[PDB]
Amino acid sequence: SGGGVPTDEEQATGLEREVMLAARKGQDPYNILAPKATSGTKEDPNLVPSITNKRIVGCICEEDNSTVIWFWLHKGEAQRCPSCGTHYKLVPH
Amino acid sequence: MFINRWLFSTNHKDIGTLYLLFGAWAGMVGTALSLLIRAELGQPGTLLGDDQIYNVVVTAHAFVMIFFMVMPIMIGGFGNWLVPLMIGAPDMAFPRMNNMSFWLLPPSFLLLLASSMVEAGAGTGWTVYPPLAGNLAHAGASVDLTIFSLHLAGVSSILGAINFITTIINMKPPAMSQYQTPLFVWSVMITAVLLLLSLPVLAAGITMLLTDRNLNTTFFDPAGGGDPILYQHLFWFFGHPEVYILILPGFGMISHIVTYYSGKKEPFGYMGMVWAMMSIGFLGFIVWAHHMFTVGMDVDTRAYFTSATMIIAIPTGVKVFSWLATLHGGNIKWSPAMMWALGFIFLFTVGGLTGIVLANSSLDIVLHDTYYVVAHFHYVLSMGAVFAIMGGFVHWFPLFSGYTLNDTWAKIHFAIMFVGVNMTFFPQHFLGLSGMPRRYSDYPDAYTMWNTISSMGSFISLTAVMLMVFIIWEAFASKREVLTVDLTTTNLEWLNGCPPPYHTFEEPTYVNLK
Amino acid sequence: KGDHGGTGARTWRFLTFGLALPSVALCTLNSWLHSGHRERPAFIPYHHLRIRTKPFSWGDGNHTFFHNPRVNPLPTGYEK
Amino acid sequence: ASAAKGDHGGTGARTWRFLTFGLALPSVALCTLNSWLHSGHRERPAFIPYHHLRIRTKPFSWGDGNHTFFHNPRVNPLPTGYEK
Amino acid sequence: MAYPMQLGFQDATSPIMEELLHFHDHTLMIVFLISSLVLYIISLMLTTKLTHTSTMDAQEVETIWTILPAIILILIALPSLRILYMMDEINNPSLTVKTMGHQWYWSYEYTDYEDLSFDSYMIPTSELKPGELRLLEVDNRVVLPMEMTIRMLVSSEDVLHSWAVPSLGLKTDAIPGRLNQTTLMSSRPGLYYGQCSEICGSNHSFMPIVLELVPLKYFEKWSASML
Amino acid sequence: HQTHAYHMVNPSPWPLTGALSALLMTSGLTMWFHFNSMTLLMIGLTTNMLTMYQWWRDVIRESTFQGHHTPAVQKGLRYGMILFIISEVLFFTGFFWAFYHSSLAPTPELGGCWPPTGIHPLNPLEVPLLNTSVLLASGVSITWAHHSLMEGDRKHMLQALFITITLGVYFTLLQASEYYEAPFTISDGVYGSTFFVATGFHGLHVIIGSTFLIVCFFRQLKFHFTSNHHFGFEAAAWYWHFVDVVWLFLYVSIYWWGS
Amino acid sequence: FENRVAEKQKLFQEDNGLPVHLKGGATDNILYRVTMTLCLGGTLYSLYCLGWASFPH
Ligand SMILES: CCCCCCCCCCCCCCCCCC(=O)OCC(COC(=O)CCCCCCCCCCCCCCCCC)OC(=O)CCCCCCCCCCCCCCCCC
Ligand code: HEA
Ligand code: HEA
Ligand SMILES: CCCCC/C=C\C/C=C/C/C=C/C/C=C\CCCC(=O)O[C@H](COC(=O)CCCCCCCCCCCCCCCCC)COP(=O)(O)OCCN
Ligand SMILES: CCCCCC/C=C\CCCCCCCCCC(=O)O[C@H](COC(=O)CCCCCCCCCCCCCCC)COP(=O)(O)OC[C@@H](O)CO
Ligand SMILES: CCCCCCCCCCO[C@@H]1O[C@H](CO)[C@@H](O[C@H]2O[C@H](CO)[C@@H](O)[C@H](O)[C@H]2O)[C@H](O)[C@H]1O
Ligand SMILES: CCCCCCCCCCO[C@@H]1O[C@H](CO)[C@@H](O[C@H]2O[C@H](CO)[C@@H](O)[C@H](O)[C@H]2O)[C@H](O)[C@H]1O
Ligand SMILES: C[C@H](CCC(=O)O)[C@H]1CC[C@H]2[C@@H]3[C@H](O)C[C@@H]4C[C@H](O)CC[C@]4(C)[C@H]3C[C@H](O)[C@]12C
Ligand SMILES: C[C@H](CCC(=O)O)[C@H]1CC[C@H]2[C@@H]3[C@H](O)C[C@@H]4C[C@H](O)CC[C@]4(C)[C@H]3C[C@H](O)[C@]12C
Ligand SMILES: [C-]#N
Ligand code: CUA
Ligand SMILES: [Cu+2]
Ligand SMILES: [Mg+2]
Ligand code: NA
Ligand code: NA
Ligand SMILES: [Zn+2]
């Protein structure tokens, strides 16, 4: 046995390295994981990160629905899914 | 910048646009060929005075319509434009390889042109059976250029299948399971699996034809212990999957169009629709010998292939009834795309039914190699595929271009086409039942009346094609820019506007798990 | 063919009800359609058949364990 | 299954090197012996111009058109028989 | 042969073709029904202002949409397979005739006793006798005895062809290196016509088949006269 | 600008040069078979190799040097290579179907027997068995290479990969010699046709797979692979196992059962 | 041999606007022009051969 093979910690670069570093911190800036829903009430809305002022949400209103409900979520007051009413609130950066 | 954008593309929408342009151009070629067929048959006697040329026209008509019109439009055009948008993905998995699947098609089509220009062309039928297609009955380069055209088309589609399967499996939002993807995306996935498995078998068979013609192999030559019938098995082992490949993306588009213009958020019976397409895909590999009921097969084999073939009508019927159940209770919008989709349902059903007639090997003895088969497949496949293509094109043209069509003109175009294709192909059932062979340049005099009517029909559809070109021109000429569309909550491809920006989903959708 | 993402419980139930049990039903049809007794062949006392080197440890020693009088001849032929 | 080893535990690099040098390369050495013992030229068979062999439906695209690509004069007769 | 404005099958000349006609009548009714039901339902779904756009449960109705088509297919397959197995059943013919396809004509061999063979070419339109049929006549017809079970063996000496006679329900591909068998039995005397049914090159449209069915005693005199 | 992990590829000329290479190779084969000229074919082979070299060079630049192969991108490439191998399995399936069709029902022109009259097969216990031990052994050595890489051991990865490539080259040279020594030819009816086309396509895949292993060897000499990220090596090993399994099917079917 | 991957990472990440197929420097441009000239000229040559082969010669 012997060494001489670089590790990812040593040699990963670019976006690969950013994803690796973020994963160590437990963060998901590149949207690799599915977010877990809150209760979705007005008091406990689902918090939707965005780098901008609007992002498309898809809502799978009940588990196992095959129809996904899509809409732009805008910064400001929380909006509700037009099918199930669950609340979403944009959280820029 | 032009060359970078349109020759060096790595963008799914621009590559989709290239495929739609290519497929539309090929559609003109294939239509011209079909009009030459029907001109030769439009009165008794000879028109071209060269029945080898007639056979070359028939063969090229089919290769053009299948490999250069339907598959590039459905999979390369609608698939590239729509699949990434419908799953919120930023492009295809292999965006550079995708461009090579496109760029292989103009050389493939050039090889087909070359085949028809050298020697006396490949007057083989699109099946290319030896020994007619071998080096004694088709000496010279034409058949070899046809084989190479198919090789390039096959590589393009195999790599495209790898791309679509990978994209659909790997690039959906993390919360979206396969059972949350739209039916068009399912239809493309299944079509791609069929292409992946079936085209390599065709590639093997046509390569053995190439080596029998040029390297003194004898795979299909009995003098060496070969067998012409082995070629037929290899060809049809691909060719049955191929007919489902040609229609499955059409089924996907029809599900979306019928849902949309019924004012519904979803198709009836989503999981049944997925089941039905998977079942058709699977059964589509075990029925091919129904193209071979007159070659001399054992009776028990004929019985098995009759029975397996009829089993496919069950999952197909689920889809037909489910489209009817999607209409059920709808706020029906009588848009031109809806008319195309309703025409598709009816004409596909007629053609599928005559296919069920043909599935009975006893009756197929009498109907094989007659115009009954030509009528079956111009209903169920040729005009099924064309009507789904026109429905999708009318429905999504405003997304791809940013401009609206004139709906009254588009309805006129539908009406002309519906008349024309029915006048062309319905009388071919009578020709087949009364025994007229296919692949003939002239016919006994008894068959004159229905041939005359069928050829008159072909000119009506020509008038429709010319009108379609004018309608597209009128939309680009007038520049009515889209503002809004309804039902965006269940039609994600529209939510980035019209046309969507070059890059979409740079920030992916947010979809949680509850 | 298709799905290939997650092979979870939902996919395996889909395969059970959508492919596996339909296949069993089709084969059950196929079988209960070729069923029906077929003519038993002429008895011929071939020496490589109906072997008896020791009596069976049940019955009269001369009947196989799942003897079916309709289709299983004894060494002396079919039973009456 | 009809093997006869043991190790398992972990299959790591050391185990696969052990297999490479202890089983795989010795097997290649033995078949190289077996083969370099049954090497040698047998007596070629009488030529018979069977019509299912030496097929020529189009000339080959090299040489004189009548020689296969890896033609061996010692063992490959032409349609007319062995070469002199 | 076909006649002007014909819509269905040529009249049956053999019992098997009769069976096919009745089986076709049975199946075409089903095709008509299903096609008109789909058309009807399309119009039924499109002709009400009443709506129901919320999610609809699909399980109950999908049982109907699978079980009924399965029953219908079985009701087609049963007579279809009975006819298939009838065709294949042992017949013991009295005569064997071979046909060899060529580009572009048929040859016939009657080698049970005598070694009779001949070629059979289409009559060009310029040579037809008045009232003869364009693209259908041949110079030498396949003389055969009526009301007798005949074995036809079909092959080719070049490319694929296919030997067909619609009114007898016959189509058997002609493949070089292969000897395909079919059985022929005409209930009636007469002239029965067919056309090459696998694309075989430029004159595929112009190599017809013409059977001439006559009583056995006349078949024997014709055979004898060939000596 | 993106907040997904996928790779937006720079606009590239290699799809077009690859597609034109295909036009030149196919029109080139046509001109060679029919018009006694190798010109177009030589240009097409050259442009094909240039296109492959530059395209895969760019994939290395995008991944080792630029960092674009996130885990999501790597997972896509895993699916892509599996799907590609599946399509190559179906291509060989067509040649096995031709072989079994002809050998299970030998026609009268063969003598009605298999092997045909006048065919004298190779002894499968001679060079064909040696070739089988060679490819099986190289499946063991490539697995040693893979584990050495995962365990961070540069020297033993390189030794094991070198042994694997040496065995692939040995197979190729043994098969070239067998082709020359074979007393039957591709023109020897369906026996020669199935033998040389099926084993020839396999030999092409051995050369392709050996070349891919050689690329991996040089990339390893240049330290491109990490102990956890080395998909080019994984893909070349999957392809190499595919080439080994196709050989085992050829050996059992054509050389042994078909002798 | 020494691990020089970091130096190639710095080269291919330099913000010079070059697409990856040219980012290695002048040699990339040469190989590109060679490849493209062979492809386009060979394609023109293939079209000539088509014209030649389309007529009896
Ligand atoms: C169906 C596609 C649409 C296009 C329809 C155009 C044609 C209209 C028919 C529209 C309705 C079609 C009915 C069949 C027409 C011929 C009647 C007949 O006696 O056919 C019998 C047989 C053979 O029968 C015989 O053994 C000879 C019987 C002849 C003796 C009586 C003489 C007079 C009968 C009247 C015939 C009229 C000639 C039609 C000449 C037509 C020239 C164009 O022919 C056949 O098998 C034809 C095989 C067709 C297979 C597909 C059937 C499903 C589609 C139609 C139903 C959907 C709803 C249509 C509703 C239509 C909505 C648009
Ligand atoms: C889009 C292309 C397409 C599609 C989808 C089909 C679908 C079918 N095809 Fe067709 N076919 C072709 C294109 C296609 N075909 C082509 C091109 C050829 C000829 C190739 C050549 O030789 O060049 C051909 C040839 C062909 C033959 C060979 C005939 C011969 O050469 O003698 C046969 C035989 O069985 C056949 C049968 C069928 C069947 C049973 C279906 C089924 O999948 C149809 C199922 C659909 C329905 C049945 C209708 C909807 C169902 C319901 C409303 C439910 C209730 C119905 C019942 C209970 C019956 N087809
Ligand atoms: C997709 C497949 C397809 C399509 C669309 C068509 C279209 C047509 N075909 Fe078809 N045809 C075949 C596939 C197809 N055909 C095949 C496989 C064969 C068998 C070949 C063989 O025997 O080897 C055949 C054979 C065949 C024959 C039998 C020849 C013979 O046996 O001798 C005839 C005869 O009338 C015929 C006529 C027509 C006509 C009149 C049309 C059309 O004119 C009908 C009107 C349709 C159109 C005009 C389509 C226009 C669409 C576009 C222009 C796309 C526009 C694009 C965008 C909007 C993005 N075809
Ligand atoms: C060392 C092990 C082998 C390594 C590979 C060596 C070269 C083989 C190349 C493989 C290409 C495989 C194509 C198979 C075509 C036939 C070649 C078969 C293998 C071979 O090399 O066969 C030789 C014949 O080659 C001949 O004809 C000439 C063959 C050259 C011309 C081939 C032209 C045809 C290529 C068409 C390819 C189509 C591919 C399409 C892919 C599409 C997939 C989507 C056998 O020589 P022989 O003298 O007859 O008998 C030996 C007597 N001592
Ligand atoms: C009769 C003679 C006919 C001759 C016809 C010859 C036709 C074609 C000329 C071919 C020129 C090939 C040039 C190299 C192509 C490499 C493609 C490749 O490697 O594609 C990759 C994807 O396919 C993957 O992995 C998995 C797939 C790899 C495929 C590699 C190329 C295969 C070409 C032959 C295909 C048919 C195979 C046989 C099937 C029967 C990468 O995808 P990109 O989108 O590029 O990048 C994505 C980035 O994230 C990477 O950093
Ligand atoms: C840098 C870009 C510019 C590159 C230009 C390349 C120009 C090449 C022109 C030469 O053409 C060659 O002529 C040969 C003889 O005239 C041919 O051999 C042919 O004739 C031979 C006679 O020796 C036979 O042995 C061969 O089998 C047969 O292929 C050969 O095929 C063909 O290519
Ligand atoms: C990057 C751009 C590359 C562009 C392509 C290069 C163009 C090459 C021009 C040379 O053309 C050659 O001319 C020869 C005639 O002089 C031909 O020989 C052929 O014709 C001869 C007769 O002159 C015979 O000996 C043989 O059939 C054969 O060798 C051969 O086919 C052909 O290629
Ligand atoms: C179990 C599976 C998926 C259910 C889901 O998880 O949503 C469903 C989807 C489609 C269903 C099938 C289709 O509805 C077609 C058939 C309908 C019959 O009523 C039962 C068998 C039948 C073959 C169904 C079995 C099963 O309920 C399927 C396969
Ligand atoms: C030079 C290099 C040392 C690793 C490093 O560069 O530090 C060593 C390590 C392993 C060596 C290789 C491996 O031992 C495998 C080969 C062994 C052959 O006997 C010589 C060439 C051969 C290919 C070696 C060449 C060279 O000496 C290598 C490549
Ligand atoms: C239809 N096949
Ligand atoms: Cu002979 Cu068609
Ligand atoms: Cu089919
Ligand atoms: Mg046929
Ligand atoms: Na005509
Ligand atoms: Na690994
Ligand atoms: Zn919701």
Author numbering:
A (entry chain S): 2 to 94
B (entry chain N): 1 to 514
C (entry chain G): 5 to 84
D (entry chain T): 1 to 84
E (entry chain O): 1 to 227
F (entry chain P): 3 to 261
G (entry chain W): 1 to 57
From the study:
pmcMammalian cytochrome c oxidase (CcO), as the terminal oxidase of cell respiration, reduces molecular oxygen (O2) to water, coupled with a proton pump across the enzyme molecule from the matrix side (N-side) to the intermembrane side (P-side) to create a proton gradient across the mitochondrial inner membrane. Electrons for reducing O2 are transferred from cytochrome c in the P-side to the O2-reduction site, including heme a3 (Fea3) and CuB via the two low-potential sites, CuA and heme a (Fea), while protons for making water molecules from the fully reduced O2 (i.e., 2O2-) to 2H2O are transferred to the O2-reduction site from the N-side via two proton-conducting pathways, D and K as described in Figure 1. In this paper, the cyanide-bound fully-oxidized, mixed valence (three electron-reduced), and fully reduced (four-electron reduced) forms are abbreviated as CNox, CNmv, and CNred, respectively. X-ray crystal structures of cyanide-bound CcOs under various oxidation states showed that the O2-reduction site controlled only the Ser382-including site, while the low-potential metal sites induced the other changes.
